[PDB]
């Protein structure tokens, strides 16, 4: 029943993980598998593989955490964590790092009240106590901004003359610590996984850019793909895993909401990065500002990322705040498809005066402002306070210099959001079982790199009519559960 | 009775203004006057004069405002304003610019309540209504941060779901506008005044650094000054007007509190500076953050200065907040005198990563943080608010880019504070009437450049025993009043 030939479009998280899974399944050793990508991962006179700097996985760090709410994504990334702690994370591809999870509102133990961004943490805190051995007694909690600042070796921001508010219903930064978190060098991870796939020798890799799907004369099936250079590749099954370009290739402007975000890096000195690492510097997440910081990484940099648009929706929802649908979203992406710069990420130009020099400069201004406020509130000498906060006797000058340091580099990365934030790993219903879609990674798919190819492979086999494939032993989510969660959205077809 | 020979040490605000006054008084055309300064204002193959980049007057802008509280400094700078609007401000040396005066607390018309930094404004607002024609009806008032932001062509920072607080006793940024304010190009001003003094031909100018005073064998009088190069200059009267170095030259570690401050400049494009000027961009003073902004200036830059240490004392006092005496202040300056970098200002080095590279790097961190917070609160897309402030449909992208732009240059400037913030323009009582001190400019002396030399000259003549000198007509402050206000502090002598 299984397919006899494959074309995988996209050597990213979904596609390259699929190629790897099929390379381990001996039932396909004789079958022809083609993995085509725009980017040449093995250019001439290069040692090993180089990752695609325009892909959404191109980053020296990606955050892997798994205290997400109970569900299928709950059990999926703890399974992935076993690989990040094993062979996938060897040679420093994975790093462990405590994570400080924070927001603004009333005390963390106090029940959720409306209109407080802490409610996103209170949900993550209540669940963290359930999974972590020891329960709520083994989970450290910081219940004020000045506790978070002290936690990093900084001074209090609160003015001296004003008295500390004992009321636990007043507004302040609230936060908890989780130790079973870390980050992976996403680039080096892809490069290693790529070298692995090449060694197993079961997969043919092709440099080329897919321009159209190809159908038969009846248009009841997909034969393969047509490249921009003329070549036409044919196989029994064609898998679209092109990241942010998938809606374009598939011709479905509503399948994903595609939009870019800017990411900032501050370079540290060897001495500074050592100082923070000795302080056990954590990954810092502040959902009230929409900013998180990771590092110091393998380049001795602190990376500052932003909550995506869909991500801020969830935070504000948990606080009983509706936000409108994203401007210029969903089908509006189609007028951009002709631009080769759309869905194309990587380094961003900087002007003489230090501005972002990019055709999407205005989109960058909000992220950069949030990053600087996040920095000053935590690492600056007075938090966000004015002159009534005295104490110029009291400061950590190393943290202050970081908080005033201009961003050293800026990069651009593209999201690929779905309505329910669920992946789409299913068959296009119009063409029987000849065209498979594996995309919609939103803003959280990289962590599942080691296991997503396997789950994707079982979905390819099951929904062909064969129910023999069931997933091993008692691993949850179930294969039947996953086929539901990543069903092809048919609303768009009719 | 008048002196027969002069030595003026310091071609700055006090000294150069004195030389100019004596150059207009015909009673001294035959008398020998010497103005010695470390810096050569007329170097070879240079056209005209160049200002001393290490002096405390070396800046492309200095703020001239005169709605200071009622008193002698009240009537003194309105007199000076007539010259800034006349010959002293010709050839663009003076610029007019509205001024937005602001702080944090309850509504501006509401009476002062304790612990609110607005109280400094409420005093300045209540007095502004007294001098300005029309009274309180002719004075524009902005009573919320979102009114100040709207006043500059920016969006509201307040979140949409939260409702506007109608209570006028809640905390917010409050501010008023004064139109009779501006700024002078301090450097070009000194250079012109210098060329004026040279043309009148009555004053001899000497390049050299004073190392010690010289006394007679009885030490009941001062003969002159000894230079580092050996030269000894003699005159009947020696005038110490060496700015921040005066305590050193005089050997009185307690006479002034000497400390540096860092100043920041963001460069604008021609189009941006034009846009703000078309918007009637004001000088912005926020005493809650201790920051003010001036420009765009003649280089198309925005300059960000900080309230001095003594200046923040006054703001917090008006709010019923005592602050301790400055660390490392007053007599502690003496261990620095041997360093040629002490009391020496000008451009500051920037590291590879963009840090301030200066032996006083830690002192800079507070000012730079305050500057960025001031910028973001007023010009950033969300003020200081987080993600609950939506409205990414709504932004002024030009203001946002400025608020994210790294500081282009940083300079250092030294203050020269007194206990009561009053100048010291009097005779050293120990040496009869042979040694005169004209220093202690604190942080507000530059504006008085056109008239301070005249007032200084009358004080030189009066306190010699001759009461004939009285100051013309009915100009206040009185000469007797000024001799009191700038009396030599004898507490230090006994
Ligand atoms: C700033 C940012 C931060 C993120 N943070 C996190 C995080 O902390 N943790 C986390 O787990 N995830 C995170 N994500 C999400 C994660 O990086 C993505 O979900 C993941 O990269 C999805 O990969 P993909 O396979 O869908 O596409 P990608 O990884 O982008 O790869 C797609 C590949 O398909 C190729 N392709 C595209 N079009 C064509 C064509 N026409 N022909 C041939 N080839 C083509 C591309 O060249 C590319 O190589 C983040 C994403 C961004 C942008
Ligand atoms: C950052 C900053 C912002 C300010 N803001 C304002 C403002 O907005 N408005 C305002 O009105 N004022 C302001 N002030 C204050 C004003 O600039 C000063 O009060 C003014 O410069 C005082 O001048 P002075 O004559 O005392 O000394 P200076 O103007 O510094 O000149 C002193 C001169 O004496 C010379 N000298 C020193 N030692 C010796 C020696 N041993 N031998 C020979 N010569 C010597 C120096 O070389 C120098 O040329 C500010 C000051 C600073 C630093």
Residues 6 or more apart whose Cβ sits within 8 Å of residue B45: none
- Which chain A residues are within 8 Å of B287, Cβ to Cβ? 387
Q: Answer for the pair A42, A469: CB distance below 8 angstroms, yes or no.
A: no
d(CA B364, CA A75): 50
Say how far apart CA B180 and CA B6 lie, in whole Å.
Answer: 38
Rounded CA-CA distance A472/A427 in Å is: 22
For chain B, percent helix, then strand, then coil, each to nearest 5? 30, 20, 45
Asked whether residue A378 falls in the same domain as residue A480, the answer is: no
Which of B368, B393, B401 is nearest residue A404 as measured by Cβ atoms?
A: B368
Extract the annotated binding site of A for FAD. 13-14, 37, 52, 56-57, 62-63, 210, 446-447
Do A61 and A55 form a contact (C-beta atoms < 8 A)? no
Is A420 exposed, middle or buried, given 0-12, 13-18 or 19+ CB atoms closer than 10 A?
exposed
C-alpha closest to that of B71 among B488, B480, B420, B477: B477
Q: Rounded to whole angstroms, how far apart are CA atoms B443 and B263?
A: 13
**Could you give the residue ranges of the DSSP H alpha helices within B279-387?**
309-318, 361-379
**How far off is chain A from B388, nearest CA to CA, in Å?**
7
Is there a contact between B104 and A355 if contact means CB atoms under 8 Å apart?
Answer: no
Q: Mutate which of B38, B57, B341 to test ligand 2's pocket (most atoms within 8 Å of Cβ)?
A: B57
- Positive or negative CA dihedral for A197, A200, A206, A207? positive
Shortest-distance ligand to the CA of residue B58? 2
Radius of gyration over alpha carbons of chain A, in Å?
24
A243 in Cβ contact with A441 (< 8 Å): yes
Burial class (CB in 10 A: 0-12, 13-18, 19+), B325: exposed
Same domain assignment for residues B365 and B478: no
B205 shares its domain with B347: no
Q: Which atom of ligand 2 is nearest to the CA of B305?
A: 1
Query: Which of B244, B329, B188, B250 is CA-nearest to residue B38?
Result: B244
From ligand 1's centre to the CA of A57, what distance in Å? Answer: 5
- The three-state DSSP-derived secondary structure of chain A is CCCCEEEEECCCHHHHHHHHHHHHCHHHCCCEEEEEECCCCCCCCCCCCCCCCCCCCCCCCEEECCCCCCCHHHHHHHHHHHHHCCCCCCCCCEEECCEEEEEEECCCCCCCCCCCCCHHHHHHHHHHHHHCCCHHHHCCEECCHHHHHHHCCCCCCCCCCCCCCCCCCCCEEEEEEECCCEEECHHHHHHHHHHHHHHHCCCEEEECCEEEEEECCCCCCEEEEEECCCCEEECCEEEECCHHHHHHHHCCCCCCEEEEEEEEEEECCHHHHHHHHHCCCCEEEECCCCEEEECCCCCCEEEEEECCHHHHHHHHHHCCCCCCCCCCCHHHHHHHCCCCCCCCCEECEECCCCCEECCCHHHHHHHHHHHHHHHHHHHCCCCCCCCCCCCCCCCCHHHHHHHHCCCCEEEEEEEEECCCCCCEEEECHHHCCCEEEEECCECCCHHHHHHHHHHHHHHHHHCCCCCCCCCCCCCCCCHHHHHHHCCCCHHHCC
Residues B289, B240 share a domain: no
Same domain, B106 and B161: yes
| A441 and A488 assigned to the same domain | yes
Q: CA dihedral defined by B439, B442, B447, B449, rounded to 10 degrees?
A: 10
Q: Are B293 and B374 in contact (CB under 8 A)?
A: yes
Nearest chain A Cα to B268, which residue? Answer: A353
Cα B229 to chain center, whole Å?
A: 32
**Number of compact structural domains in chain B:** 2
* Strand partners of residue B64: B182
Last residue in a domain, options A416, A447, A473: A416
Phi, psi (degrees; rounded to nearest 5) at B195: -60, -35
Q: Work out the number of other CB atoms within 10 angstroms of the CB of residue A223.
A: 19
CA angle A326, A331, A337 (to 5 degrees): 110
Q: Which residue of A has its CA nearest to B392?
A: A366
Q: Give which of B267, B324, B387, B408 to mutate to test A binding, by max A Cβ within 10 Å.
A: B387
Cβ neighbours, 10 Å, residue B445: 21
Q: How was this structure determined?
A: X-ray
Task: Report d(CA B344, CA B260) in Å as an integer.
Answer: 9
Residues of chain B positioned with their CB less than 8 A from the CB of A388? 115, 117, 288, 316, 319, 321
| Positive/negative CA dihedral, B90, B94, B97, B99 | negative
Does B303 contact ligand 2 (Cβ within 6 A)? no
Strand partners, A103: A174
Cβ of B366 and A397 within 8 Å? no
Residue of B nearest to A289 (CA): B386
Determine contact, residues A302/A399, Cβ cutoff 8 Å: no
Inspect the interface and report whether the beta carbons of B288 and A161 lie closer than 8 Å: no
Instruction: Tell me, using a 6 A CB cutoff, whether residue B417 lines ligand 2.
Output: no
Cα angle: B186, vertex B188, B194; to 5 degrees: 100
Phi and psi at residue A322, to the nearest 5°: -85, 140
How many other β-carbons are positioned within 10 Å of the β-carbon of residue B429?
A: 13
Residue with CA nearest ligand 1 atom 22: A441
Which residues does chain A break after (C to N > 2.5 Å)? Answer: none
Q: Confirm or reject: Cβ of B305 under 6 Å from ligand 2.
A: yes
Last residue of one domain, picked from the residues A361, A385, A416: A416
- Domain hosting A34: range is 5-90+185-256+418-492
Please give the distance, rounded to the nearest whole angstrom, from the Cα atom of residue B293 to the centre of ligand 2.
20
What distance in Å separates the CA atoms of residue B366 and residue B361, rounded to the nearest whole number?
10
Q: Are residues A305 and A396 in the same domain?
A: yes
d(CA B181, CA B436): 33
Resolution in A: 2.6
Main-chain phi, psi angles of B104, to 5 degrees: -115, 135
Q: CB distance A388–B327 less than 8 Å?
A: no
Furthest-apart CA atoms within chain B: distance in Å: 81
> Strand B346-347 relative to strand B301-306: parallel, antiparallel, unpaired?
unpaired
Contact A226, A211 (CB under 8 A): yes
A304 and A379 together in one domain? yes
> Residue B409 burial (CB < 10 Å; 0-12/13-18/19+)?
middle
Q: For Cα atoms B53, B56, B58, give the angle at the middle one, nearest 5 degrees.
A: 40
Indicate the pairing of strand A283-286 with strand A99-105: parallel
Helix axes B361-379, A361-379, angle to 10 degrees: 130
> CA triplet A261, A266, A272: central angle to 5 degrees?
150
Nearest to A380 among B369, B384, B404 (CB): B369
Instruction: Name every residue whose Cβ is closer than 8 Å to that of residue B87 and which is 6 or more positions away in sequence.
Output: none
Residue of A nearest to B307 (CA): A387
Q: Specify the pairing of strand B409-417 against strand B257-267.
A: antiparallel
Write down how long chain A is: 494
Q: At CA B428, angle to CA B422 and CA B433, rounded to 5? A: 125
Strand pairing category for B32-37 and B5-9: parallel
Indicate whether residue B416 lines ligand 2 (CB < 6 A): yes
Q: Spell out the SS3 assignment of A431-442.
A: HCCCEEEEECCE
Q: Are residues B195 and B81 in the same domain?
A: yes
Strand pairing of A210-215 and A204-207?
unpaired
Q: Are residues A338 and A198 in the same domain?
A: no
Say if residues B459 and B451 touch (Cβ distance below 8 Å). no
* B4 C-beta neighbours (distance < 10 Å), count: 11
Q: Which residue among A161, A376, A387 sits closest to B115, beta carbon to beta carbon?
A: A161
Cα separation, A238 vs A315, whole angstroms: 37
Which residue, A416, A438, A463, sits at the end of a domain? A416
Residues 6+ apart with CB under 8 A from B56: B12, B13, B243, B244, B345, B413, B414, B415, B416, B441
Which residue in A378, A369, A363, A447 sits closest to A413, CA to CA?
A: A363
Which CATH number fits the domain that encloses residue A160?
3.30.9
> CB–CB of A353 and B269 under 8 A?
yes
Q: How far apart are CA B109 and CA B144, in angstroms?
A: 12
The protein residue whose alpha carbon is closest to atom 4 in ligand 1 is A443
Instruction: Suggest the residue from B307, B404, B408 to mutate for an interface test with chain A (most A CBs closer than 10 A).
Output: B404
Same domain? For A74 and A201 the reply is yes
> What is the DSSP pairing of strand B283-286 with strand B291-294?
antiparallel
- Closest residue in chain A to residue B351, using alpha carbons only: A405
Q: Tell me the best of B19, B62, B240 to mutate to test the pocket of ligand 2, counting ligand atoms within 8 Å of each CB and taking the most.
A: B62
Are the CB atoms for B31 and B6 separated by under 8 Å? yes
Cα–ligand 1 centroid distance for B29 (angstroms): 83
CB spacing of B388 vs A319 below 8 angstroms:
yes
Measured CA to CA, the distance from residue A379 to residue A375 in angstroms comes to: 6
Question: Are A319 and A387 contacting, i.e. CB atoms less than 8 angstroms apart?
Answer: no
Q: How far apart are the first and last CA of chain A?
A: 29
For residue B380, the chain A residue with the least C-alpha distance is A369
Q: CB B47: neighbour CB atoms within 10 A?
A: 6
- Binding site membership of B57 for ligand 2 (Cβ less than 6 Å): yes
CA distance B103 to B179: 18
Q: Which residues line ligand 1 (CB under 6 A)?
A: A 9-15, 36-39, 52, 55-57, 62-63, 209-210, 241-243, 245, 249, 261, 263, 305, 413-416, 439, 441, 443-447
Same domain, B54 and B82: yes
For residue B487, give the CATH number of its domain.
Answer: 3.50.50.60
**Residues tagged in the binding site annotation of B:** 13-14, 37, 52, 56-57, 62-63, 210, 446-447
The answer, yes or no, to whether the previous bond of B296 is cis (omega within 30 of 0) is yes
Annotated binding site of B for FAD: 13-14, 37, 52, 56-57, 62-63, 210, 446-447
Counting ligands in written order, the one closest to the CA of B225 is: 2
């Amino acid at each position: 029943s299984i397919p006899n030939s494959f074309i995988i479009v996209g050597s990213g998280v979904f596609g390259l993980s699929l190629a790897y899974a099929l390379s381990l399944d001996d039932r396909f050793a004789d079958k022809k598998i083609i993995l085509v990508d725009r980017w040449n991962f093995e250019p001439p006179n290069a040692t090993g593989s180089v990752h695609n700097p325009a892909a959404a996985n191109a980053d020296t760090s990606r955050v892997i955490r798994r205290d997400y709410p109970h569900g299928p994504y709950a059990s999926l990334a703890l399974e992935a964590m076993k690989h990040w702690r094993g062979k996938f994370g060897e040679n420093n591809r994975y790093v462990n790092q405590r994570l400080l999870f924070s927001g603004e509102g009333s005390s963390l133990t106090t029940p959720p009240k409306a209109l407080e961004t802490v409610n996103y943490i209170k949900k993550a805190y209540a669940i963290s106590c359930e999974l972590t051995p020891g329960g709520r007694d083994a989970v450290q909690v910081l219940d004020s901004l000045d506790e978070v600042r002290a936690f990093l070796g900084n001074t209090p921001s609160h003015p001296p003359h004003l008295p500390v508010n004992k009321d636990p219903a007043a507004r302040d930064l609230r936060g908890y610590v989780s130790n079973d978190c870390g980050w992976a060098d996403a680039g080096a991870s892809i490069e290693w996984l790529r070298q692995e796939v090449l060694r197993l020798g079961r997969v043919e890799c092709v440099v080329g850019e897919v321009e159209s799907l190809v159908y038969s004369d009846d248009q009841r099936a997909v034969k393969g793909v047509k490249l921009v250079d003329g070549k036409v590749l044919t196989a029994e099954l064609t898998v679209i895993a092109a990241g942010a370009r998938s809606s374009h290739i598939l011709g479905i402007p509503k399948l994903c909401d595609v939009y870019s975000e800017f990411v900032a890096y501050i370079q540290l000195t060897k001495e500074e990065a050592d100082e923070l690492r000795r302080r056990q510097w954590p990954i810092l997440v502040n959902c009230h500002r929409g900013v998180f910081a990771v590092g110091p990484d393998h380049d001795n940099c602190l990376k500052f990322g932003h909550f995506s648009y869909s991500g801020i929706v969830d935070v504000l929802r948990e606080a009983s705040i509706q936000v409108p649908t994203r401007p210029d979203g969903w089908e509006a992406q189609q007028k951009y498809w002709s631009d080769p710069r759309f869905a194309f990420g990587g380094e961003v130009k900087v002007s003489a005066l230090g501005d972002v020099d990019d055709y999407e400069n205005p989109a960058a201004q909000r992220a950069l402002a949030d990053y600087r406020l996040f920095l000053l509130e935590l690492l600056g000498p007075t938090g966000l306070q004015g002159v009534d906060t005295l104490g110029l006797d009291q400061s950590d000058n190393l943290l202050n210099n970081i908080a005033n340091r201009p961003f050293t580099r800026v990069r651009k990365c593209w999201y690929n959001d779905t309505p329910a934030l669920d992946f789409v790993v299913d068959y296009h219903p119009s063409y029987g079982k000849t065209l498979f879609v594996a995309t919609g990674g939103c803003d959280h798919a990289f962590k599942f790199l080691p296991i997503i190819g396997e789950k994707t492979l079982a979905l390819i086999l099951r929904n062909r009519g064969d129910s023999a494939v069931s997933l091993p032993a008692g691993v949850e989510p179930s294969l039947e559960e996953l086929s539901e969660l990543w069903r092809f959205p048919v609303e768009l077809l009719q």
